[PDB]
Amino acid sequence: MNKYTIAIDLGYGQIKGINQDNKRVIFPSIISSGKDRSLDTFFNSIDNIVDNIHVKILDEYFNEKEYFVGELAKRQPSNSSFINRDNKINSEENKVLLATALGLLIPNDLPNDTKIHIVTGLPLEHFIKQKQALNDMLKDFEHTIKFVDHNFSRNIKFEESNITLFPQGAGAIFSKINNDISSLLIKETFIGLIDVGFKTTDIVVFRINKDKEPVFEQEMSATLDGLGMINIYNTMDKAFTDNSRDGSKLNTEQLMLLCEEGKIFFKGDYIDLKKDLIKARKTLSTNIINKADGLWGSRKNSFNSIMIAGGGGKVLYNHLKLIEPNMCQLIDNPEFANAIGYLEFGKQF
Amino acid sequence: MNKYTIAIDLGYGQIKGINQDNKRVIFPSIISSGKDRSLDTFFNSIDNIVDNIHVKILDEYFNEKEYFVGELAKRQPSNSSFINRDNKINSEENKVLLATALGLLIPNDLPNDTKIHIVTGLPLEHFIKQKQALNDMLKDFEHTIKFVDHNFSRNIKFEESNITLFPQGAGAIFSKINNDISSLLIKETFIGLIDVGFKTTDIVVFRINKDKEPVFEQEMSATLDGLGMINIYNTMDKAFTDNSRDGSKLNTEQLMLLCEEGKIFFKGDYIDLKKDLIKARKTLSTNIINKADGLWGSRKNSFNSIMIAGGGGKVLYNHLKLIEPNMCQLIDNPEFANAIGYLEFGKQF
Amino acid sequence: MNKYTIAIDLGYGQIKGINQDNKRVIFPSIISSGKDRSLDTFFNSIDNIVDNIHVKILDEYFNEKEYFVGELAKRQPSNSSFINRDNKINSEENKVLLATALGLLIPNDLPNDTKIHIVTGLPLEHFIKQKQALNDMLKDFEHTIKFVDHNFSRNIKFEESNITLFPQGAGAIFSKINNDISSLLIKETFIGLIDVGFKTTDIVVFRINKDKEPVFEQEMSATLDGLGMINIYNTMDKAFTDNSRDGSKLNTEQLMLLCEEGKIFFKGDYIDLKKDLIKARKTLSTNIINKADGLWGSRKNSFNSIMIAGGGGKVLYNHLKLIEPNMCQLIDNPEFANAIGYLEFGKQF
Ligand SMILES: Nc1ncnc2c1ncn2[C@@H]1O[C@H](COP(=O)(O)OP(=O)(O)O)[C@@H](O)[C@H]1O
Ligand SMILES: Nc1ncnc2c1ncn2[C@@H]1O[C@H](COP(=O)(O)OP(=O)(O)O)[C@@H](O)[C@H]1O
Ligand SMILES: Nc1ncnc2c1ncn2[C@@H]1O[C@H](COP(=O)(O)OP(=O)(O)O)[C@@H](O)[C@H]1O
Ligand SMILES: [Mg+2]
Ligand SMILES: [Mg+2]
Ligand SMILES: [Mg+2]
């Protein structure tokens, strides 16, 4: 029996994942306290399970705890922090989003021989430091998820020879383009992978050799600390205080709505803030281009094709084309590049 | 033939109802017992049928009891207590007020196979608490009504899959404005209905989505149970006992005459209580605004059009404009918002 | 002058004490030898006096014995028994624990002729059997205690008519909730309080009368000797030695850490005993289900609230929910449940 495989992304913009059977889930990194949903059931019947994940979690002593999670969490004004959310990998906030995307992707009642090979991700510089905090976490991981309003459960438990760790964007450029990168790579060319995340952006590059195989360069690749979408949400936060001049603060929902579209329905009116949206997209891309050439000296002329990824890279792409025009390009799925890049690369074993 | 529909509200200021054929009747929720009326029939023959509803109602054991009900029972001193009466839905005072609203709206020649889809309702916090008690009541509602001085007898009995249980304020804004409010709602706003009634104030809100479709907020919407127009009838009679200086109390007719005008006829004189009436209509409006704003934080700036309804919401519209000026609005029928909202949203069955 | 209030508990697991001004202490009930602490001062800060309890005790005949007690004594390998500690309530061990309890709670700058009223704890059967043994030893008390490395002594003396005696589980529901649950208690129910102590578990119920006052049932309430947290340390003792397969015994310290973690670090390795530790609490959870219904026939259905107490029940609340799910509930401070009741109900004088 071929043991199952689930690859998930432990991001902070939105939690991404995909199973062995190519079903993929996506939801923001937002939790909230769960409460009993019976009245709104009669109003709006829940068909999208992902939109309204109402969920209970058991543990080693059945210490039951319910959660509004996902879009259901984002509907709450009592939701997660999301502006100073936990960077510790062993937080319960990380435990919620990890266990939730399991039962979204585990098919019902798998055989016990067919256990699940989970392949997860870390930040590039933080792959070494927070490895044992997550290696201990995944080995200790033994719970029972309960789906409220959808009513199917998993006794989630994982061990070694099933848990698998890779940095952010490890097998995204090695595999999944593995038959198409062979035309790209010739001899001593430099491929580039840029995952524009929420908190940090990882620029990860491989060096191909005389034997046409990519070797890793930890000196041309690092974690751009504090550079991502979190600057754009912070900058557009101050633009609302500058335009409305009320001192009012947008919530978690309105500020994410602001940098998604540019127009917030404030006091019956669309406060138009579209001007500093694309200006922040240029300024973030300018921060990326300038910090691209920090690690990159004259080796930028050794490029064959740069790939970009991340949810931020999908909306930056025209201004993020200004790294290397007509050579840098977008990956097939900007969000899900790490997802299948952990999955088929995790299906190697 | 086709099964009929009669949409009535179990109102405690006045019973609000309208049938499938768009005939509507309305009467205060006051019952008495009944005695045969032939003396005043010679003086005042019944021109207004609703003004003088003497009613005889058989039951499943055919143990009939006579009842003065409505404006007639308001003219009776032997009427129900009605100001400290419970809102228990299977009580004897509710079987009379429901059936009296039936036979005024029941058209002639309804066969027994064309069972009336009575669209009943429960308040917003009471649609979970008091749902099975009306399932207790409507299953038990097996009676036979007879009108006095008009004399057409309707065999009143209702079963499951004919009866209908929507929340109060649910279909009043999900339907009945659904073709018009969608022109006003575009993106992630909150539409809301506040039914300021007699005992309860149903503040019910929806959240619309990107697709201009409302999802229900069960945490920004609640019933202000015990907060309504019954506090104004409570407040102003206390000011009259110190103004009359006899210690006497206005009864179930004169107290309704008191806060509706401000000046009660006492011993050849209309004793004035105009000053504290506006104070009663600000203090009630003080805790419909601020009690909604306990559920309405900074998402109140994302509101588009707050609707208000109810007979109390009809008469607070100057003071209840102070929820948010030039954003709040009154529905065209403050009485028949819920009843047509029962009816229009009861057309789906 | 005024006579102050200090409430302590003679819990065999850990002594739990509080003054009138709500400054409360907690430390395990283990003593050891007191030796010269000079060198440990220079390396590490002796800041928390609860962490570093080096104690000299003068007698009234001044024999001047010296003790490590509690947390520092827990780190001593030559400590007290604590798994077969003697049940003599008049022991010097109990005195040293009580003198340490009084020392951290008697404040400085207390006026000259002030004294303290003190409240103790007794098992509910042993409050009458073992009454005068403790009630003479508290009268016997006149000692001077010295806290090393903090430089303040306490000459502590008590007489008759200042000590006060109430048994275990008394004040936690007779007071401390009497202002709150009196809204909840109506007529002829029983409230529940389950103190999950270290050695003995406490079952106590109060009948409420018609007039909303608590009254006591001696045959619906008992003291569970031999039932409590102490069975779990006995169970996990052999559970390690059988799993060590060497006869290697944990110390007194790792014994306490074992039922707090289940993963003891041993010979450079985590010995995981999570299997038996889940079973042992459920073994204790089973043995309180049966003793509950031993005192509760159909009178279990005559409940309106069940509380639980004891430091063990804090990690057993969801696991002792199996008797009455959501009819049972949790006290605020499961350690300090008896003491705050002894604080509040001890304020009769
Ligand atoms: N359609 C979109 N419009 C605007 N921003 C988007 C869109 N899609 C994704 N994003 C941004 O991308 C981020 C998602 O990044 P993601 O690839 O999940 O990285 P991470 O792994 O760090 O979470 C979100 O925080 C969001 O701001
Ligand atoms: N013209 C009016 N003047 C004063 N008060 C009115 C008037 N019309 C209605 N009301 C008040 O509104 C209440 C009716 O509320 P209603 O919408 O029937 O709510 P409910 O469903 O709780 O009975 C009455 O009790 C009455 O005090
Ligand atoms: N955090 C914790 N983890 C595990 N066990 C605990 C914890 N806190 C308290 N306990 C257990 O509870 C006991 C304390 O019980 P306590 O309320 O002091 O009762 P007593 O009055 O009999 O001493 C300890 O022996 C300990 O085993
Ligand atoms: Mg990422
Ligand atoms: Mg109403
Ligand atoms: Mg105790």
Residue numbers in the entry:
A (entry chain q), B (entry chain r), C (entry chain N): 1 to 349
What does the article say, verbatim?
Functional ParMRC plasmid segregation systems comprise an actin-like polymerizing motor (ParM), a centromere-like specific DNA sequence (parC), and an adaptor protein (ParR), which attaches a plasmid, via the parC, to each end of the growing ParM filament or filament bundle. Thus, the force generated from ParM polymerization is harnessed for plasmid segregation. Here we investigated the ParMRC cassette from pCBH, a 257 kb plasmid that carries the botulinum neurotoxin type B. This ParMRC cassette is also found on other C. botulinum plasmids, such as pCLK (267 kb) and pRSJ2_3 (245 kb), which encode neurotoxin types A and F, respectively. Despite the similarities to actin, pCBH ParM is a genuine ParM, since it has a closed β-barrel, a feature that is missing from actin and MreB structures.
Due to this complexity, the helical parameters were determined by cryoelectron tomography (axial rise 5.2 nm, twist −50.1°). These parameters refined to a distance 5.03 nm and twist −50.4° with the cryoEM data. Helical averaging of the cryoEM density, from each cross-section of the filament, based on these parameters led to a 4.7 Å map for the entire filament. The pCBH ParM filament has a diameter of 26 nm and of consists of 15 loosely associated, left-handed helical, single strands arranged in three layers in cross-section. At the center there is a single straight helical strand. This is surrounded by an intermediate layer of six interacting twisted helical strands that have the opposite polarity (antiparallel) to the central strand. The outer layer comprises eight non-interacting helical strands, which have a different twist and polarity (antiparallel) to the intermediate layer strands but have the same polarity (parallel) as the central strand. The 15 strands are in register in each cross-section despite having different radii and path lengths. The major type of inter-strand interaction occurs between complimentary basic and acidic patches on the protomers. Prominent in the acidic patch are two acidic loops (A1 loop and A2 loop), which adopt different positions across the basic surfaces of neighboring protomers in a lateral cross-section, allowing for multiple types of inter-strand contacts.
